[PDB]
Ligand SMILES: CCC1=C(C)/C(=C/C2=NC(=C\c3[nH]c(/C=C4\NC(=O)[C@H](C)[C@H]4CC)c(C)c3CCC(=O)O)/C(CCC(=O)O)=C2C)NC1=O
């Protein structure tokens with residue numbers, strides 16, 4: 008149905024991205040099997056092409072979800088000014104964090120490298136681990152390292 | 156995500172065989188007694204503000220050094236995040252209680268929580284204590300006989316206690 | 328996206344007065360025949376590919392210009408689009424039937440559908456004939472008494488015929 | 500609104516596929532106990548006057564400060580507004596009952612409740628206590644399954660307010 | 662897997678809320694709908710090998726050429742592993758009955774079906790009409806309430822194959 | 824309807840003479856037989872439901888292998904109709920007890936029994952075992968004469984089943 012909508016032109020490519028993000032595949036892979044941290048990382052990486060820049064992004068998006076639901080959480084990504092300026096209505100999202108994007112922290116590059124995992128790799132969730140979050144400590148302890 | 160039925164099914168499939176008669180008996184008993192489970196899940200859902208508030212009162216009346224300045228629940232943003240985490244953990248416990256399986260809890264609340272709380276400096280011992288206090292406040296509510304028919308639900312009490320203990324032992 | 332219950336609540340709130348006795352009684356009736364309604368929508372869902380295939384066969388037989396080069400269903404792409412539209416129409420018809428209200432059909436399936444075909448050059452008369460043949464096949468598959476307990480469902484057949492017919496009229 | 504049929508149809512249309520076993524089972528689960536819900540709504544639609552006056556007087560009792568002059572509770576038109584408010588809540592509980600879901604309750608009371616309540620300076624505990632009294636007396640006016648449905652829906656309203 | 666319980670939890674989870682009345686309503690419908698389904702699963706499991714033999718010979722009777730030399734059904738391995746495939750379909754239909762949802766079918770069979778049928782040239786019609794034979798045989802194997810459930814899942818498998 | 828007096832009438836009317844000593848004496852004898860049979864039938868009519876149900880469970884207990892999926896009796900309706908069958912035969916036992924002859928039995932059930940059983944695949948041995956259960960109880964329930972002719976009638980019933 009979404010592909011037919013796109014072919015007719017009732018929805019732009021951005022609206023189709025929104026529909027796929029609200030689809031059951033996106034949930035069953037990235038939301039339902041993962042903590043909220045991993046979900047925010049994946050949302051940034053997939054709908055914005057960038058890694059999270061700081062911990063306030065995680066806090067804001069977790070509160071947005073807890074108060075308004077998955078649909079509002081997704082809308083905050085696609086209707087954001089950043090998606091509209093970078094990709095707009097008619098461009099497919101791509102990994103733009105590899106080249107310096109205006110306003111990014113120093114870490115966004117390293118975090119996108121940590122998320123990437125190569126051209127073959129993927130955000131599967133069928134791993135033996137179960138889609139754990141990668142950037143839990145790189146976001147709140149951006150520089151240092153701690154052992155338990 | 157899983158429940159009891161899908162867990163038995165997955166075990167049987169990984170083995171490659173139909174579900175045996177005994178396992179069908181177990182799932183039939185589960186479904187037959189699931190009405191008590193619905194009552195318990197409702198007891199958690201409907202009183203949840205009371206559980207959260209009583210647990211918060213007790214936690215901050217026994218562990219003062221959280222609400223002190225420099226304590227890690229000092230401002231309203233940190234106190235609000237504390238209460239929000241308490242509610243979320245209680246929510247996933249009620250979920251896992253309805254499902255009969257703790258997989259949703261271990262996959263959405265507990266698979267990266269100890270690491271997050273360590274990376275934020277929050278004392279995971281106090282978080283586990285908060286979870287146990289919520290367990291106590293909830294058990295005061297699951298044993299309520301008002302508005303429900305009398306019966307025995309020791310099994311559901313044990314199951315909910317083990318879910319709270321799973322949350323505590325996977326945060327602490 | 329309204330059902331009979333939501334619609335009736337809407338008029339009741341438009342008046343501002345409580346729901347009466349008679350309307351609530353007919354809603355309870357609607358609930359009682361809800362099982363026959365669920366079997367009706369099940370009969371529609373179960374046989375959807377067969378209904379689409381037979382309706383398509385009859386339609387393409389009656390209008391050979393659709394198939395021949397220059398027709399509106401000539402290439403494989405346009406035939407696939409035709410069959411997909413037929414299936415979507417039947418899907419929304421079953422949606423409306425289970426909801427018991429034509430609101431599901433009209434609110435999303437029929438808004439811009441009428442003029443999209445005209446802008447595409449699609450003859451809407453052929454679409455009306457397609458959904459009419461679909462209605463015939465659906466009636467045939469609905470009167471089937473195999474594998475189900477027998478009873479009166481004439482209101483269900485009339486309601487389904489109204490849904491198919493108003494879908495035809497709105498498209499045309 | 501949002502009734503069991505409504506989520507069933509919405510979820511089925513989201514994947515763009517017909518209603519499979521699970522959706523029909525959910526619709527059946529709603530249908531088979533539509534009758535305790537409707538009989539409970541019938542039982543608590545006859546007593547609406549007793550319900551509204553009892554709730555208003557219980558709110559006055561529990562909160563003495565909302566009775567004397569110098570506040571919103573005092574006033575003939577204000578008390579008429581209180582009675583109208585309680586009648587609206589009870590009517591939307593009846594709508595939730597007949598819908599066999601929280602839909603009418605949601606999109607009549609719960610949605611946009613906090614800021615609407617706040618911009619007019621009304622204590623949420625007021626209506627929470629009113630609904631608590633409604634809970635108390637509907638526990639006895641209704642027995643068994645109808646009582647269960649009532650308790651659940653009025654408490655969902657309370658939790659929304661609280 | 663997508664069941665009634667799991668779909669309820671995922672819907673109340675993605676919205677960040679507790680389980681309200683409608684969700685427990687659907688859960689209760691599942692719980693009491695379980696018993697016919699469990700009995701249907703017991704019957705299909707008891708009558709497994711006979712059903713598989715019947716479906717295999719139905720494939721061969723309706724598709725007589727398939728067993729002729731030079732193509733798919735020729736040779737002992739392909740018959741034994743036809744039996745294997747029908748056993749898989751039957752096992753997952755019973756799994757979906759016990760779970761009272763189309764989870765196991767949509768996961769272990771329906772997801773990825775067209776690609777592997779295309780890449781091995783397995784005609785779907787063989788499986789569609791073997792499932793039709795099982796659909797018929799449950800008419801005299803089951804009866805009453807659970808027959809509707811078993812027919813419903815046999816039916817979903819047939820629709821997905823087509 | 825060949826009660827003893829009925830074939831008395833048949834023998835009388837077949838030829839031209841009136842009724843002689845033998846048939847009058849036989850009619851007298853039957854007319855004292857009428858009593859103990861009448862208390863037997865009354866006692867059995869007093870003990871209807873427990874006896875018929877116990878017969879049904881006895882049929883289960885002596886024939887457990889059918890009780891699996893495989894009974895023609897499997898399912899609530901079919902077990903209930905087993906019970907109603909036993910009730911029908913108990914009806915006919917009482918009727919033949921009153922009639923002092925096999926009249927009801929041979930007229931209705933014994934008439935065309937074997938071919939009906941063949942058509943409906945109902946093993947008589949089940950019925951026979953049920954009547955052996957009835958033997959067991961009627962050994963206690965009735966005494967002396969009533970017992971004796973009741974036992975003889977249900978013996979003839981066994982033989983009819985065989
Ligand atoms: C919201 C509900 C909805 C509707 C109403 C709908 C209809 C619909 N049909 C379309 C194309 C089409 N539709 C048809 C079908 C018609 N032409 C033939 O003559 C048949 C007789 C007749 C079918 C009964 C055909 C042949 C096309 C292909 C035209 C093209 O590809 O440009 C399109 C645009 C392309 C696409 O779907 O990818 C839409 C939106 N789709 C929807 O999601």
Ligand SMILES: CCC1=C(C)/C(=C/C2=NC(=C\c3[nH]c(/C=C4\NC(=O)[C@H](C)[C@H]4CC)c(C)c3CCC(=O)O)/C(CCC(=O)O)=C2C)NC1=O
Pocket residue numbers: 042043044065066069221227228232233234236237238239240241243244263264268271275277278281282285
């Ligand atoms: C969806 C499942 C999920 C949960 C629940 C979760 C917990 C979670 N808690 C957080 C912070 C926090 N968590 C707490 C709670 C602690 N403070 C006190 O010591 C208490 C003992 C204890 C609570 C009972 C506090 C105070 C913060 C804020 C700390 C900060 O802002 O640095 C954060 C990150 C920043 C934020 O929320 O503002 C997460 C992600 N993560 C998840 O993926």
Ligand SMILES: CCC1=C(C)/C(=C/C2=NC(=C\c3[nH]c(/C=C4\NC(=O)[C@H](C)[C@H]4CC)c(C)c3CCC(=O)O)/C(CCC(=O)O)=C2C)NC1=O
Pocket residue numbers: 190191193194195197297298299300301303304305306307308311644647651682685686689
């Ligand atoms: C809409 C959501 C929903 C609710 C709320 C619900 C409650 C519910 N509880 C029931 C019985 C019951 N309820 C309880 C639970 C209580 N008894 C125990 O002692 C505790 C005090 C407490 C639980 C810890 C028990 C034990 C039964 C009887 C068990 C049975 O039904 O066999 C029944 C069946 C009536 C009966 O057999 O008596 C219902 C419908 N069902 C639903 O579909």
Ligand SMILES: CCC1=C(C)/C(=C/C2=NC(=C\c3[nH]c(/C=C4\NC(=O)[C@H](C)[C@H]4CC)c(C)c3CCC(=O)O)/C(CCC(=O)O)=C2C)NC1=O
Pocket residue numbers: 383384387388394400401402403406
């Ligand atoms: C763009 C060009 C184009 C192609 C190629 C095309 C294929 C095509 N062939 C058709 C008819 C058919 N064609 C065949 C022929 C097959 N069966 C045997 O005879 C042979 C092994 C084999 C051909 C060598 C058959 C049997 C049908 C009837 C199918 C049916 O009605 O079920 C139909 C259905 C038309 C109808 O009757 O409603 C299509 C769509 N359609 C197109 O628009």
Ligand SMILES: CCC1=C(C)/C(=C/C2=NC(=C\c3[nH]c(/C=C4\NC(=O)[C@H](C)[C@H]4CC)c(C)c3CCC(=O)O)/C(CCC(=O)O)=C2C)NC1=O
Pocket residue numbers: 361362363364365366367368370469470471472475476477478479480523524526527694805806809810813
């Ligand atoms: C879980 C999903 C679901 C299923 C599988 C379902 C089948 C279903 N059909 C039923 C009865 C029935 N169903 C029908 C409808 C049929 N009779 C005629 O043949 C019509 C052609 C046809 C309408 C399409 C009728 C007339 C009855 C008996 C009357 C009654 O429901 O009380 C019943 C209730 C009593 C029973 O049969 O044991 C169920 C559960 N209903 C459901 O909600």
Ligand SMILES: CCC1=C(C)/C(=C/C2=NC(=C\c3[nH]c(/C=C4\NC(=O)[C@H](C)[C@H]4CC)c(C)c3CCC(=O)O)/C(CCC(=O)O)=C2C)NC1=O
Pocket residue numbers: 558565571572573577578580581584587607608615619620621625626629
């Ligand atoms: C159907 C949707 C709906 C709701 C939910 C509703 C509540 C409500 N009551 C109002 C007025 C009022 N309501 C009250 C009652 C409160 N103050 C005290 O008296 C009591 C303790 C307490 C009741 C338990 C009062 C005093 C006013 C006067 C105006 C004001 O305070 O804003 C207002 C402001 C606008 C108006 O209606 O005049 C709202 C929104 N009204 C609605 O149309």
Ligand SMILES: CCC1=C(C)/C(=C/C2=NC(=C\c3[nH]c(/C=C4\NC(=O)[C@H](C)[C@H]4CC)c(C)c3CCC(=O)O)/C(CCC(=O)O)=C2C)NC1=O
Pocket residue numbers: 720727733734735739740742743744746749750769770777781782783787788791
């Ligand atoms: C999860 C459940 C599951 C299914 C359903 C399944 C189907 C399946 N069947 C296969 C082969 C096959 N399946 C068949 C079936 C045919 N045999 C007879 O002739 C009949 C006409 C007909 C069956 C009704 C045949 C002939 C092959 C071998 C074809 C080949 O090797 O290319 C294969 C390729 C792997 C192999 O068996 O070597 C798959 C994946 N596999 C699965 O893991």
Ligand SMILES: CCC1=C(C)/C(=C/C2=NC(=C\c3[nH]c(/C=C4\NC(=O)[C@H](C)[C@H]4CC)c(C)c3CCC(=O)O)/C(CCC(=O)O)=C2C)NC1=O
Pocket residue numbers: 882894895896897901902904905906907908909911912931932943945949950953
């Ligand atoms: C006085 C005249 C009379 C007779 C002779 C009688 C026996 C009798 N048994 C029948 C079938 C049946 N009979 C039974 C009971 C038997 N099957 C089980 O194995 C038990 C061991 C056993 C009970 C002792 C059952 C379960 C059926 C259903 C089989 C079918 O419908 O094909 C039927 C077919 C009609 C129906 O479906 O109800 C009759 C008439 N009932 C009568 O009113």
